[PDB]
Amino acid sequence: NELADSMISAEKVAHVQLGNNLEHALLVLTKCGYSVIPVLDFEFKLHGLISAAMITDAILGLERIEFERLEDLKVEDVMQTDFPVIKDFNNNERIVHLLVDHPFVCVVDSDHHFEGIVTRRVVLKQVNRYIH
Amino acid sequence: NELADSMISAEKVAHVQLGNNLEHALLVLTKCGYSVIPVLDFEFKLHGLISAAMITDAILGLRIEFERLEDLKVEDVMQTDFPVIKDFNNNERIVHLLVDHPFVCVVDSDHHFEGIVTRRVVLKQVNRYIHLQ
Ligand SMILES: Nc1ncnc2c1ncn2[C@@H]1O[C@@H]2COP(=O)(O)O[C@H]3[C@@H](O)[C@H](n4cnc5c(N)ncnc54)O[C@@H]3COP(=O)(O)O[C@H]2[C@H]1O
Ligand SMILES: Nc1ncnc2c1ncn2[C@@H]1O[C@@H]2COP(=O)(O)O[C@H]3[C@@H](O)[C@H](n4cnc5c(N)ncnc54)O[C@@H]3COP(=O)(O)O[C@H]2[C@H]1O
């Protein structure tokens, strides 16, 4: 229902490049402001999602949060790999069902090439539009 | 509408307390799994919202300076300008805020924190409507 024409194009999407370390990923997360962003390789294929909580949980020590380890771990060590996806817009009831539990959903082609995202905000804008 | 009945009760909402340091706030954020949560005082008054993004941005030097986490208080970085629900008389205002806020706190007239209203409850009704045709 014209969620297709609303998808946030991949090139406007903040992301972390695969292979980067967690120090770098924290920097990208902090600068862009977004709490969960996708992880891509140099061909812009989607491998996972990353957040600050994923990074911090991975450096929890027995006495302190071991930040010195941020340099040593890479984003693929801690990124989330099981996450829903959209391959086409012929099933946009699925998008809405999905958005109930996921702030955004990645859309990809058959080769898992990252096309962009659909966000809750897109839907809620339309809901507020039909009431007022 | 039924928006009132679907509020998440306060006892189910993770929060950090005033006066703690930024390291404490990170541990709570990381442990509870939510990325933005309220800041309450010892009487359950609502004072702010805090995320890891606010925390890390506050120690972002010229490199991130994690050593200052023990010296900064949550009230030094928490967000203090945010909307709140006082009543459920104007629920189309609640739909309007969810456009730009993943959740909105509801308070009583003394700013005691009573719970939150999340985008998720509106999205469920949307999904329900489409399932009925
Ligand atoms: N820089 C900004 N400008 C304006 N509003 C902002 C904003 N940052 C956050 N918000 C508001 O906060 C909501 C939650 O953002 P969060 O980063 O947790 O979660 C976001 C974020 O993780 C991801 N996302 C959205 N846009 C993105 C982008 N350009 N790049 C990367 N990720 C994005 O999708 C989730 C849902 O986004 P949605 O827009 O529905 O909902 C957003 C948006 O309504
Ligand atoms: N344990 C869990 N079980 C089921 N689903 C989970 C979950 N943790 C996260 N999610 C899903 O992820 C969405 C975004 O969560 P986030 O922590 O960014 O953003 C959350 C968080 O900042 C806050 N929030 C919601 N419930 C909370 C709670 N019990 N305590 C503290 N904050 C909460 O309101 C935002 C919107 O929450 P909403 O439920 O609309 O949307 C949630 C929820 O649908």
Residue numbers in the entry:
A (entry chain B): 12 to 143
B (entry chain A): 12 to 73, 75 to 145
What does the paper say about this structure?
The facultative intracellular pathogen Listeria monocytogenes, like many related Firmicutes, uses the nucleotide second messenger cyclic di-AMP (c-di-AMP) to adapt to changes in nutrient availability, osmotic stress, and the presence of cell wall-acting antibiotics. cbpB encodes a 150-amino-acid protein that is conserved in some Firmicutes. We determined the structures of free CbpB and CbpB in complex with c-di-AMP at 1.6- and 2.4-Å resolution, respectively. These structures reveal that CbpB has tandem CBS domains (CBS1 and CBS2) that interact to form a disk-like head-to-head homodimer. However, here we found that CbpB is a direct activator of RelA and that c-di-AMP inhibits CbpB-dependent RelA activation.
One of the adenine bases of c-di-AMP is located in the cleft between the two tandem CBS domains (CBS1 and CBS2) of each monomer, while the other is projected into the solvent. Specific recognition of c-di-AMP is achieved by a large number of hydrogen bonds with both main chains and side chains of CbpB, some of which are mediated by water molecules. It is π-stacked against Tyr45 on one face while its other face is flanked by Ile19 and Ile128, thereby forming a narrow pocket for the binding of this base. In contrast, the other adenine base of c-di-AMP has no hydrogen-bonding interactions with CbpB, and it is not flanked by residues from the protein either, except that its N-6 atom is positioned against Tyr45. Overall, the binding mode of c-di-AMP in CbpB defines a new type of nucleotide recognition by CBS domains.
